[PDB]
Amino acid sequence: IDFSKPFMSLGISIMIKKPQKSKPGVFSFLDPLAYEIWMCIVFAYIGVS
Amino acid sequence: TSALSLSNVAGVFYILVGGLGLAMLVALIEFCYKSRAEAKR
Ligand SMILES: *C(=O)CCCCCCCCCCCCCCC
């Protein structure tokens, strides 16, 4: 087929959603410290005892 | 601001083990001393 010169420009692009977040967890009180700092506060407590 | 990592505190846990190790030494040295000196009587 034939085409005119372009009337609008574009390029392929990516659309993503915006996870609203705002959804805390039940045990979200453990986030400050990483998981390994709790697996080792529990191994130090058995040790020191 | 992510969760605090083990490396960040990996040092406290050493002083703990080291202290626990020193503790057992201090105890068994007294024991050793108190042991022989008793048999020697
Ligand atoms: C009498 O004098 C005998 C004393 C024996 C002492 C043995 C060593 C004490 C405990 C050391 C524990 C080290 C734990 C960490 C290893 C990596």
mmCIF file of all heavy atoms in Angstrom, chain B residues 21 24-25 28-29 32, ligand 1:
data_model
loop_
_atom_site.group_PDB
_atom_site.id
_atom_site.type_symbol
_atom_site.label_atom_id
_atom_site.label_comp_id
_atom_site.label_asym_id
_atom_site.label_seq_id
_atom_site.Cartn_x
_atom_site.Cartn_y
_atom_site.Cartn_z
ATOM 1 N N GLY B 21 33.752 -17.131 74.498
ATOM 2 C CA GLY B 21 34.904 -18.001 74.430
ATOM 3 C C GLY B 21 35.808 -17.680 75.598
ATOM 4 O O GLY B 21 36.295 -18.581 76.281
ATOM 5 N N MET B 24 34.463 -19.145 78.895
ATOM 6 C CA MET B 24 34.711 -20.556 79.150
ATOM 7 C C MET B 24 36.159 -20.771 79.547
ATOM 8 O O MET B 24 36.454 -21.611 80.403
ATOM 9 C CB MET B 24 34.371 -21.380 77.912
ATOM 10 C CG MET B 24 32.948 -21.223 77.433
ATOM 11 S SD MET B 24 32.626 -22.173 75.944
ATOM 12 C CE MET B 24 32.960 -23.822 76.525
ATOM 13 N N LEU B 25 37.080 -20.035 78.929
ATOM 14 C CA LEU B 25 38.478 -20.130 79.323
ATOM 15 C C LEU B 25 38.638 -19.736 80.786
ATOM 16 O O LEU B 25 39.231 -20.474 81.577
ATOM 17 C CB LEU B 25 39.330 -19.253 78.414
ATOM 18 C CG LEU B 25 40.830 -19.316 78.635
ATOM 19 C CD1 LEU B 25 41.341 -20.684 78.268
ATOM 20 C CD2 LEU B 25 41.497 -18.251 77.800
ATOM 21 N N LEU B 28 37.365 -22.548 82.988
ATOM 22 C CA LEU B 28 38.119 -23.793 83.016
ATOM 23 C C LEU B 28 39.525 -23.591 83.558
ATOM 24 O O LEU B 28 40.136 -24.557 84.018
ATOM 25 C CB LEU B 28 38.177 -24.437 81.637
ATOM 26 C CG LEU B 28 36.837 -24.679 80.962
ATOM 27 C CD1 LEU B 28 37.009 -24.903 79.477
ATOM 28 C CD2 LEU B 28 36.184 -25.869 81.610
ATOM 29 N N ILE B 29 40.062 -22.373 83.507
ATOM 30 C CA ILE B 29 41.382 -22.150 84.083
ATOM 31 C C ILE B 29 41.290 -22.236 85.598
ATOM 32 O O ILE B 29 42.098 -22.907 86.248
ATOM 33 C CB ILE B 29 41.953 -20.797 83.631
ATOM 34 C CG1 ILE B 29 42.439 -20.869 82.189
ATOM 35 C CG2 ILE B 29 43.090 -20.373 84.524
ATOM 36 C CD1 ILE B 29 43.071 -19.587 81.711
ATOM 37 N N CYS B 32 40.840 -25.906 86.410
ATOM 38 C CA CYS B 32 42.149 -26.607 86.299
ATOM 39 C C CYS B 32 42.965 -26.319 87.563
ATOM 40 O O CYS B 32 43.293 -27.279 88.279
ATOM 41 C CB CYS B 32 42.896 -26.149 85.059
ATOM 42 S SG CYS B 32 42.265 -26.746 83.473
HETATM 43 C C1 LIG C 1 42.791 -25.844 82.052
HETATM 44 O O1 LIG C 1 43.599 -24.953 82.131
HETATM 45 C C2 LIG C 1 42.160 -26.271 80.760
HETATM 46 C C3 LIG C 1 41.450 -25.156 80.063
HETATM 47 C C4 LIG C 1 40.885 -25.544 78.704
HETATM 48 C C5 LIG C 1 40.331 -24.383 77.920
HETATM 49 C C6 LIG C 1 39.837 -24.735 76.542
HETATM 50 C C7 LIG C 1 39.422 -23.545 75.717
HETATM 51 C C8 LIG C 1 38.286 -22.790 76.354
HETATM 52 C C9 LIG C 1 37.074 -22.555 75.491
HETATM 53 C C10 LIG C 1 37.327 -21.913 74.154
HETATM 54 C C11 LIG C 1 36.070 -21.800 73.328
HETATM 55 C C12 LIG C 1 36.256 -21.265 71.934
HETATM 56 C C13 LIG C 1 34.970 -21.165 71.151
HETATM 57 C C14 LIG C 1 35.118 -20.558 69.780
HETATM 58 C C15 LIG C 1 35.808 -21.427 68.766
HETATM 59 C C16 LIG C 1 35.851 -20.799 67.398
#
